[PDB]
Design a protein around this nucleic acid. Structure first.
Ligand SMILES: [Mg+2]
Ligand SMILES: [Mg+2]
Ligand SMILES: [Mg+2]
Ligand SMILES: [Zn+2]
Ligand SMILES: [Zn+2]
Ligand SMILES: [Zn+2]
Length: 143
RNA sequence: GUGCUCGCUUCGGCAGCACAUAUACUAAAAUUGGAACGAUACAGAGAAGAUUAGCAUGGCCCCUGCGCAAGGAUGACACGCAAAUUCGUGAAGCGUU
């Protein structure tokens, strides 16, 4: 029923107060894996995976850098077990990059002209009020 | 969005600055045509009597094979009243200058 752990040592100290929500996020991810595509476009059906992955990683990130509610050990346990993304966090700690979607949406090898997605353009520099949905992600304006 | 402003100056708002700067064969489609054996009837395997191994050759014919191997009926086709330049003799009869 839960995620099979791969550490086999017991989880660290403050585990028991973050587990209902981690399992609730984990139950939410298993919904999105099994949704049948019908009226969902070919790229659109993968958008919930990136959203929930953002959410799980944001949750551990808030409990350790904002709320200071978790030690290094419980933090690095959640990264090793796959609850949080190590690389997505390392971009959120950068200066401009603090509500980033994905690592796809800043990867310049993934685009034709070698650039970020329009996801990453500040909404004030589009100056028109056009509506954006990133094809990688579904995002409407990180930056 | 975040941070810094000995910014107004409260913790409400605003101002300034810094970082952050252009995805997508753009459809979950509408269309548009050419196509699956294989069944339907027909159809029957070259070499001058008959029964037959085959190896080629040529290209707006392909199939199987990774093949510059080898197979596919010798893989099939090829079977054509197969006419390409350029004429003269001799007498004989009839009409004519
Ligand atoms: Mg042969
Ligand atoms: Mg034979
Ligand atoms: Mg032959
Ligand atoms: Zn994204
Ligand atoms: Zn994006
Ligand atoms: Zn985004």
């Amino acid at each position: 029923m839960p995620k099979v752990k791969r550490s086999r040592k017991a989880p660290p100290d403050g585990w028991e107060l973050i587990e209902p929500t981690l399992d609730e996020l984990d139950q939410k991810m298993r919904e999105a894996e099994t949704e049948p595509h019908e009226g969902k476009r070919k790229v659109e059906s993968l958008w919930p995976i990136f959203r929930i992955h953002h959410q799980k990683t944001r949750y551990i990130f808030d409990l350790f850098y904002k709320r200071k509610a978790i030690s290094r050990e419980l933090y690095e346990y959640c990264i090793k077990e796959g609850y949080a993304d190590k690389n997505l966090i390392a971009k959120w700690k950068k200066q401009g990059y603090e509500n980033l979607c994905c690592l796809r949406c800043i990867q310049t090898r993934d685009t034709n002209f070698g650039t970020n997605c329009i996801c990453r353009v500040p909404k004030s520099k589009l100056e028109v009020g056009r509506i954006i949905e990133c094809t990688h992600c579904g995002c409407r304006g990180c930056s």
